[PDB]
Every structure is written in C-alpha cells, then in structure tokens.
Design an enzyme around this catalytic site. Structure first.
Site, PDB file in Angstrom:
ATOM      1  N   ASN A 149      25.022 115.038  30.423  1.00  0.00           N
ATOM      2  CA  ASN A 149      25.344 116.620  29.722  1.00  0.00           C
ATOM      3  C   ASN A 149      25.160 116.957  31.398  1.00  0.00           C
ATOM      4  OD1 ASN A 149      24.097 119.126  28.516  1.00  0.00           O
ATOM      5  ND2 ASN A 149      22.328 118.347  27.967  1.00  0.00           N
ATOM      6  N   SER A 163      25.710 120.017  23.178  1.00  0.00           N
ATOM      7  CA  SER A 163      25.237 118.828  24.101  1.00  0.00           C
ATOM      8  C   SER A 163      24.468 118.274  23.606  1.00  0.00           C
ATOM      9  CB  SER A 163      24.268 119.871  25.026  1.00  0.00           C
ATOM     10  OG  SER A 163      25.110 120.441  25.746  1.00  0.00           O
ATOM     11  N   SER A 188      26.047 121.165  19.099  1.00  0.00           N
ATOM     12  CA  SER A 188      26.523 122.041  18.738  1.00  0.00           C
ATOM     13  C   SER A 188      27.660 122.373  17.666  1.00  0.00           C
ATOM     14  CB  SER A 188      25.829 123.260  19.513  1.00  0.00           C
ATOM     15  OG  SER A 188      24.562 123.199  19.320  1.00  0.00           O
ATOM     16  N   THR A 245      30.525 125.489  22.592  1.00  0.00           N
ATOM     17  CA  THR A 245      29.616 124.324  24.008  1.00  0.00           C
ATOM     18  C   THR A 245      28.968 123.285  22.787  1.00  0.00           C
ATOM     19  OG1 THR A 245      27.836 125.616  23.918  1.00  0.00           O
ATOM     20  CG2 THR A 245      29.972 125.939  25.351  1.00  0.00           C
TER      21      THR A 245
END
Length: 361
Positions: A344, A319, A66, A317
C-alpha cells in the site's frame, strides 16, 4: 524489445516509471495493464511472495480494496436497469427493519454516492446482522443526508446488500454467480478458491509483514475483491463499451450507467462509486480529487444527473493493509490503466504514474 512495435513502446514508458516506483517504495510485485486502440498490454514486475519466492504472472491475484465498491455499484445499476431497484427510494423502503430510523431519509443513491453521512469504517465490534441492524437503527448523521460527501464502507455495504436483495440473492452470489461471470471476469473473486491460492499474492504491510485482508461484515461490498490485472482491464474495456460481452445488453447499460454524475464535490464528480474529473485534467486537480478518502466535503447535487460522458477521466483507488491499486480510464480516448501492487503505497504516486502513462499514449 522492438523499435516501432506497440508493446515495446508502451513497455519502455511503463518500465521507466514502475521500476523506480517499486524500488523507492519497496513494492515486491506489481502488474500494470494498459488498453489503447482496442489492444491490451500486461506488464508484470517482481514478486507475488517473498519466501518461498513466487513471481508475479498473468494469473497473480491482488487485493484491490475500494475498487471492490465499483462492483457493488455495477450490481446496483444492473438491478436498476432491470427494474428491480429505484435509486431515489429510501434505504428503509428496501430494508424494512430500518423503517422509522434515519434511513427513512437516506436514499439508495446517497449510499451509492457517499452522501448518506455514514462514517468510513464499520465499527469493529459489529459481528453479525443483528448487531448491524441495531447500530443502523440507532444512527444519526451530523449533517442531513445529501449535503456532504463522506467516503464510506458502511454505505457501500448497504448499496450492495440492497442491490443483491432486490435480485433475490446474497451479495456473494450476486457478484460471483451473476456479475463477474456476465463480465467474463473468471479470475476475480470475493473468496479465492483452492486452485488459485498459489496465485494469490501476499500483501506486505507497513512493517513489511505478509498479510491478507480479513473479511468482516459487509466487507465483500466495500473491499472484498481479489483479481488479476487482466480481468480488471477487461472490466475497463467493458466500461468503455468495447466488448461484445456475450450480448448482455442489460449489463452494458448497467456498466455505462454507473458513470452517471450525481454530485459535485471539490474537483470531482461523484458517480455511482466511480469518481470522475473533466478531461483533459491537470495533475494538481487529479491529485486533489484523489485526496478525498477520509474527510467530509460539501456535496452539491447534479440534477438532472450528468449523463455518462466520454470527455472525462474516470478513476478509483483501492487499498488494503498489504496492497495498493488504481484504475483510470478515459472513454473518449478508449484508453485505460490498471496498476496493482502488493504494498500500500501513496495515492499521489499511483495517480502521477497513471497520468504520465496515459499522457504518453
């Protein structure tokens, strides 16, 4: 190591948090980049790949999930400041095949702020544009657009698609030919080229299997970037106005304008993909503000929008199945951090380590 030297003082702080983090989470490799007082520090740890073993180096590429969305927002902002895109217009204004659908009542700003109501994940059976348009034409949200925040890959996809079209190009061209080059981010890609594959870390999933992200429709917008910590640190500096940036005045304006605050939700202010909290921020509130990825929350408009601020903690954040990334920066303190990992691991740990590192500076 040298007493009283910037890079050694910071390295001690960073090592003391990152080495236990990697051990406890079985993270094979990380890179952590920090900027403070106009100076940059890059620390590499462990392995980009296990077999054959390859170390993390200054050139190691990580998937950032993201974080990719902030580039879609920067592109939309660039289109806006260039006079090619109005964020208040409807999606169907720019995507005429959606005229007469729910997208008559969803703005570009809604898709740029996770307030359209579109769900998090693209349905996996949507393989081409025809299928995507049929889905979107038939879609309706449970609540009216603009009432709730639902973090969305689909909405981010529309944001980037619309922005690129308004500039006359595909999203991939917009990013790899216009945006990343103007930002000086020469080791950042949506598709890693052959001479860089040796530098592309493997991700390690929950079962410790080596994986790379599978790129699907509108995936470039939502999760497609592979990049180095150094390139992301340059992006953080550009977001703080620190770099000459090749005299690209529209580009600086575009970067800064992504920090405009458009909705309040919970502890956060939702900007154009970037998310921010008031600074100084407590760790509990920062943790809460980073636990908004998969649930709907009430959103309240900020109108007129909050101008880009200095006294805020701006973060995102990201992942993938094999990677975990985080960026945070505080413009008022001209400080920022990029943490990239090829596993992750939980977001609470990313945020807590970043909070401790930036607090030390």
């Amino acid at each position: 190591h040298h007493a009283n030297i910037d890079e050694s003082k910071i390295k001690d702080t960073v090592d003391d948090l990152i080495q236990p983090l990697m051990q406890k989470n079985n993270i094979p490799g990380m890179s952590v980049a920090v900027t403070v007082n106009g100076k940059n520090y890059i620390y590499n740890y462990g392995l980009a790949a296990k077999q054959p073993q390859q170390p993390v180096t200054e050139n190691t590429l990580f998937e950032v999930g993201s974080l990719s969305k902030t580039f879609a927002a920067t592109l939309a902002s660039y289109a806006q400041v260039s006079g090619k895109l109005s964020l208040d217009q409807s999606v169907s204004h720019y995507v005429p095949e959606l005229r007469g659908s729910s997208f008559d009542h969803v703005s570009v700003l809604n898709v740029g702020t996770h307030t359209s109501g579109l769900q998090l994940f693209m349905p996996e059976d949507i393989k081409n544009t025809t299928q995507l348009m049929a889905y979107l034409k038939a879609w309706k949200p449970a609540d009216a657009a603009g009432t709730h925040r639902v973090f969305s890959n689909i909405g981010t996809g529309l944001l980037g698609m619309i922005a690129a079209k308004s500039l006359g190009v595909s999203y991939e061209d917009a990013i790899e030919k216009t945006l990343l080059p103007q930002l000086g981010m020469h080791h950042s890609y949506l598709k890693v080229p052959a001479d860089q594959m040796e530098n592309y870390a493997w991700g390690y999933n929950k079962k410790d299997e080596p994986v790379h992200v599978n790129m699907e429709i509108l995936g470039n917008e939502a999760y497609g970037i592979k990049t180095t910590s150094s390139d992301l640190l340059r992006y953080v500096q550009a977001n703080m106005g620190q770099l000459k940036l090749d005299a690209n005045a529209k580009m600086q304006q575009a970067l800064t304008a992504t920090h405009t605050g458009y909705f309040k939700s919970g502890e956060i202010t939702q900007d154009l993909m970037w998310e921010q909290l008031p600074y100084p921020v407590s760790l509990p509130n920062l943790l809460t503000g980073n636990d908004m990825a998969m649930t709907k929350s009430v959103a309240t408009p900020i109108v007129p929008p909050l101008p880009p601020q200095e006294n805020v903690w701006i973060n995102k954040t990201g992942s993938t199945n094999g990677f975990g990334a985080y960026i945070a920066f505080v413009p008022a303190k001209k400080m920022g951090i990029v943490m990239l990992a090829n596993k992750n691991y939980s977001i609470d740990q990313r945020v807590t380590v970043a909070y401790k590192i930036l607090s030390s500076l």
